[PDB]
Amino acid sequence: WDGKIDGTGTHAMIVTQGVSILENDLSKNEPESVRKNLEILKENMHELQLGSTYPDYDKNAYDLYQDHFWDPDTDNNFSKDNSWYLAYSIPDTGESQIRKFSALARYEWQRGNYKQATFYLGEAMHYFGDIDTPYHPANVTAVDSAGHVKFETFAEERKEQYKINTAGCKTNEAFYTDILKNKDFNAWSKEYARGFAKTGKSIYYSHASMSHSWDDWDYAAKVTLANSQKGTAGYIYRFLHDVSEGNDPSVGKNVKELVAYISTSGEKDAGTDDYMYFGIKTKDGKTQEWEMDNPGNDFMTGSKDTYTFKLKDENLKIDDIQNMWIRKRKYTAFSDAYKPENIKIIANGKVVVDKDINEWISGNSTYNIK
Ligand SMILES: [Zn+2]
Ligand SMILES: [Zn+2]
């Protein structure tokens, strides 16, 4: 979807309606906590809107051209066994970004940081809207500097006509009730989002592609924006319940993957061009290292980088992981010290490590974070 850096545009509309939807569908016997947390979200509407649009303008990433179009099965494929050379981190997908930002949002809300939490939530919804955008050609045709395409700008000038204010039922009915059943947030999200994304892919072939008429486009925008709004409301509903009832999705399950959200200091020369690795050591002495690499320029000054690591051993619990570290290895003979500001590690939907560092890492050395 289209959006603007000031928090306006299609993305912001979706997220704004996501709240109205909840405002009207929330049944009477819903817990006060859910109801009062919704009020806190509404009071931070602007932040929700800024988060909803920010990913298309984020300048603290990898200095690459934005493109938010993936095949709906990408995440599922990357999850299968064998289908990936484990020494390499897994690429970021909209599907995985929903989970990352949702985890960051929950962690922040529980520590009282509502503004930061809302922003992160908005970012999670931005990616859900994307996978719900019916645009799936092999070759993309960008029309602006933010990587948007013509279908999105077409929907943008007509966004107001596509609004909805109800999911179709009350939160005490099937749609909302089914959302709370799966205590495994990450598992639920995967199956929940694919549905919207596949329907979106189908709509692309039958209505939204460039060969279809304007009426087909208007209809495509109508049905996919309704799905996006509804789907978004469902996410926000799940979020409110998760943060209200102190719900933990990682409850006693295996850790097949770890996610690193690294904040590099804004101080001059803090970023590095040297090789960077992440590693872990179990209670039984087994170790595994991964190279943190993405298509763009990694670890830039003041950047916020993301790396997904798939484990060899799929039968380890979070507690079995004793140590965690990052390691630098010289690319050239010239100095290129690295200064990370903060490092968060996520496992099964929960922020298990939140560490401020603000220390220089030089030469070929290892910095332990746990
Ligand atoms: Zn978008
Ligand atoms: Zn986007």
PDB file of C-alpha atoms in Angstrom, residues 8 22-23 48 68 77 99 104 108 175 190-191 286 307 329:
ATOM      1  CA  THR A   8      -0.860   9.847   6.247  1.00  0.00           C
ATOM      2  CA  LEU A  22     -12.331  -2.688  17.389  1.00  0.00           C
ATOM      3  CA  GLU A  23     -14.158   0.284  18.959  1.00  0.00           C
ATOM      4  CA  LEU A  48       0.293   4.126  15.177  1.00  0.00           C
ATOM      5  CA  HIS A  68       7.705  -5.033  -0.318  1.00  0.00           C
ATOM      6  CA  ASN A  77       9.685 -22.398   2.319  1.00  0.00           C
ATOM      7  CA  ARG A  99       6.395 -11.215  14.125  1.00  0.00           C
ATOM      8  CA  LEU A 104       9.133  -5.622  20.106  1.00  0.00           C
ATOM      9  CA  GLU A 108       7.728  -2.287  25.122  1.00  0.00           C
ATOM     10  CA  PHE A 175     -13.543 -14.460  13.874  1.00  0.00           C
ATOM     11  CA  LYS A 190       1.939 -17.655  10.019  1.00  0.00           C
ATOM     12  CA  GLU A 191      -1.362 -19.366   9.220  1.00  0.00           C
ATOM     13  CA  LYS A 286      27.644 -27.542  21.460  1.00  0.00           C
ATOM     14  CA  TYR A 307      19.177 -11.092  11.183  1.00  0.00           C
ATOM     15  CA  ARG A 329      36.667 -10.547  11.551  1.00  0.00           C
TER      16      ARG A 329
END
